[PDB]
Symmetry: D2
Subunit: 267 residues, 4 copies
């Protein structure tokens, strides 16, 4: 297995369509021993993760809760055993209030809403690294999930801004992680039909935002030289596992694009 | 004059070494009629701006104050006269609490501090555009001040993250401003010895942060094919005036580098 | 005038739809004294440039002719008078054999054809700088024409590769030009309906290449927050004049996008 | 093994310090069956590759020889057996005449020399893809070697321009390769002390070019958050193997940086 013997923490599972669910599945298929973290609905998350190939301890983590973060390392060590450390950390956490996405005009999002989204989607990447680097082995790897924000797009709005901040945060986390012999990188995925994404395309945030997202998705498969299947998160999961392995040992502070090549093509 | 007849709002003057002071001076030398905005110390700012070549009305603007923003357009129209609109807006506003810069470790900045810095340094670019676009003429231009955040650097820390967010915000403001026939762009300046910057180099945020900033400044002049004079903000001011003029009419959502060419060179 | 008193060489006029024709027109409107260079059809070019607002000497320059380049500085000094130097140089030269563009497959262009296109479109930017920098004044400016090659696109094919090379060449020319106090920059224009471009859209290089170019053009105006008029080269000409002026004095080795903002937007 | 059962062609071995030698070693350690290609000194190359963990057929390939390219697919199929196809292709080929590198001024390289370097270092990536894609399996992968050319640097000179062209070529090769279900990507390596590189640092291309290269190398390890060992090509080889594997299945037209993270950091 690509990850045989590695101990890896995976955040961000909420449904069976979560990108993190497929990261966890593939990592377990490749021999990794997982610790999972979940937010708010731990009963639901436990029922979801019961469908993974192997059992994994589930710990509560609200990345806005300073007490959850202060205790996280101790709770992880309790789960994997004293004297054992983590080899991998997966950040698959994102949120932006609906005022900062959708048909609500970009100018109408209040800063309280934007700040909450930047807290959860960008600052928390630094928060998790701060908490977990002291229990990470040399040669370890931290990976977060990104959506290419280098150009503006309709509807994504403030979530795009949060991803631009996350990319900048990743470059500073790499500086800190390097002192531990640990890499830090993001995977910029193409669009994936999660429950939330399908709801938006169905009009949950207004009709025009739904129409814009659908047009965005269609251009992606058209641009990608190898195509793009928004219903299949497995290529994204494999790319995360690649970064968690020892096979990209000189890459850090960086972004790997698991997007079909779409960002390399204009039309 | 390059800006003859144009009515331009300039934020961000606090001392005579403020980049915005030199923007205002050059704009007035080029025939623009200015409205100035200042934060908190309006008595001091008035005394400072008395040294500009021409008198200009000064309005109070704390970009974190929703009431200041809601009234800003009316106060500007009162200053320039009913029936007159703005042709230009200059955002020269930035702040990050010292916990997010300097020798305080990157991981030790609390999110309340980071959020305040992102509010003032990035979100407020959208806030000012929201307030002023309804009183801007077609062909108008909004310009904000940037510091290239595409790579991490020592000490800048969370302020770098805020600039990454600002660049993303600028691309969305351009979408909105375009409906008004208005351009939105940033000027990414090289380092300029403002009062705050000189204090940091003198050790105000710790000795190692001061040493890192000084090394950063020295490499800049070395890399710049035409050199870089951190004691001279006039080239930055002229570049802002270029974007405020009619001579870059097909550039928007973009970044112009007034940095000596340093960002185009590795060594 | 923006360029009053400046002596500026402009290459690349071949028809009245040439981007360089509009650069020359606007520069003369702004008070510049021009020297023109033309390739192969000097009788035709003279008849074309007779329609410019002011007379200008026309010199023959085939950038593949080492003898033309070796004599160019002397012929320019003879035209503007001994003791006078150039303040500006405009490179508006590009060519790629049809085997390297159009419906002919990317893999089918022979290297002899590609090499000729890279010679004319990229290496010659260095060739002209080598020839003219010794007769350029401090504070001078060299500008070349670019088409954003950061992503692949249909039909442009090897010409895209040549533009990627040109952008790299520009960064090295800036290093050399800086020793003379001269800036070097490119303007990346949106698509402009020159005679050659209209012929391609009409099917001169095959129907599918024509269809691809037309779709490329349409997406450009759609993406540009301020729109894009491919029939109007005047915004591109003004941006070149901006770089030729003294109003971007700290920008070199760089690229200014005169494209409506289209490259800052995904959809 | 990461590459068990895969049939992979590796070009570019000339000494035991060649990056391609270490690519081949690691690929064989990971179970790949190799076909090697060599240029000009096949007796020497055979003696060198005798030290690889497994025997591999060696075929002559001068990428400037149209007859070598026209026959290459048939010679590969003869080596791996009829009915078998390649799963991987490694382009590790580069050359620029000394007039285009070193202390010889950038402006003094004749175009004949530059054109030869661009032929070997950039066009040949398309040439090899044209030759080998018809005998490549779906899910296959083409990888070429890159050195980040996004900023100019001393001494690299025209070789930097060639790498900028190669990056553009890679994006078009991905378009073609996608029709075969094949990915195309580059690995941008940090500096590696090959025989040629050590000779340049020793002054083979002039003293100042040697001094500039040494300073470039030292800044690299300083910038890299995980450090950079120019004497160890193994991290670069592993990254190439990662791209040759099935673990980056949604990445194409792209660049993976195996450089210690140095390109993500300013100082
Ligand atoms: N779906 C896409 O198209 C796409 C593309 C690229 C990147 N991404 C990114 O991938 C990440 C995962 O998102 P997803 O698509 O799988 O959707 P998701 O809804 O399945 O996952 C979001 C996760 O964030 C977690 N979360 C929210 N608030 C939290 C908090 N306070 N503390 C801890 N966790 C919290 C959710 O509980 C949930 O598990 C996100 O960063 C997302 O931006 C998604
Ligand atoms: N000095 C440099 O080296 C440099 C380089 C590039 C960009 N910049 C940017 O240029 C901008 C101007 O900074 P400066 O260098 O001239 O320093 P400065 O201190 O002179 O200007 C900062 C300005 O921000 C204003 N400000 C702070 N909080 C505010 C608030 N709540 N509301 C309104 N205004 C507020 C200050 O009052 C002050 O006028 C900043 O965005 C800065 O990041 C500076
Ligand atoms: N038209 C567009 O859409 C567009 C967009 C961006 C950039 N550009 C660039 O702008 C430049 C000008 O092109 P244009 O669009 O105006 O088309 P054009 O055909 O009008 O200009 C091309 C010029 O190149 C010159 N030229 C060709 N071979 C030459 C040689 N051996 N020596 C000297 N000159 C030679 C032609 O004679 C001609 O004057 C080109 O670099 C082009 O790539 C064009
Ligand atoms: N050494 C570094 O620091 C470094 C860094 C990044 C990338 N690279 C790239 O890695 C690649 C491999 O270079 P290297 O460092 O290992 O040096 P090298 O000298 O070992 O390899 C160069 C190879 O190019 C081959 N070659 C030259 N002309 C050829 C031709 N006409 N046909 C076929 N092959 C030809 C040589 O025979 C030789 O095998 C190059 O593309 C190089 O630019 C090197
Ligand atoms: O980060 C996230 O959770 C969302 C990612 C995403 C998914 C589908 C479409 C888009 C769009 F905005 F590009 F349309 C974005
Ligand atoms: O945005 C600001 O106000 C500060 C900009 C700045 C000034 C001098 C040095 C640096 C450094 F961080 F690069 F060193 C940054
Ligand atoms: O450089 C040139 O002369 C051509 C530029 C150009 C003009 C119109 C369309 C396109 C396209 F390839 F994007 F379609 C390119
Ligand atoms: O591509 C190549 O073969 C050379 C790559 C290389 C190796 C060492 C140093 C440098 C420098 F130019 F950055 F110094 C480049």
């Amino acid at each position: 297995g690509l990850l045989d013997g590695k101990r890896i923490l995976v955040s961000g599972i909420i449904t069976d369509s979560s990108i993190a669910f497929h990261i966890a599945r593939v990592a377990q298929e490749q021999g990794a021993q997982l610790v999972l973290t979940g937010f708010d609905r731990l009963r639901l998350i436990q029922r979801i993760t019961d469908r993974l190939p192997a059992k994994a301890p589930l710990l509560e983590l609200d990345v806005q809760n300073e007490e959850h973060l202060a205790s996280l390392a101790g709770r992880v060590t309790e789960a994997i055993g004293a004297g054992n450390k983590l080899d991998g950390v997966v950040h698959s956490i994102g949120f932006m209030p609906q005022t900062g996405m959708g048909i609500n005009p970009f100018f109408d999002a209040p800063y309280a809403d934007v700040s909450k989204g930047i807290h959860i989607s960008a600052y928390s990447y630094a928060s998790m690294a701060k908490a977990l680097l002291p229990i990470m082995n040399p040669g370890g790897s931290i990976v977060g999930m990104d959506f290419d924000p280098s150009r503006a797009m309709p509807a994504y709005n403030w979530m795009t801004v949060a991803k631009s901040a996350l990319e900048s945060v990743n470059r500073f986390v790499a500086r800190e992680a390097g002192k531990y012999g640990v890499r830090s990188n993001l995977v910029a995925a193409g669009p994936i039909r999660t429950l939330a994404m399908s709801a938006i395309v169905g009009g949950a945030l207004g009709e025009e935002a739904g129409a814009q997202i659908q047009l965005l998705e269609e251009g992606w498969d058209q641009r990608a030289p190898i195509g793009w299947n928004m219903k299949d998160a497995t290529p994204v999961a494999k790319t995360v596992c690649a970064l968690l392995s020892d096979w990209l040992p000189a890459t850090t502070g960086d972004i790997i694009y698991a997007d079909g090549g779409a960002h390399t093509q204009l039309l």
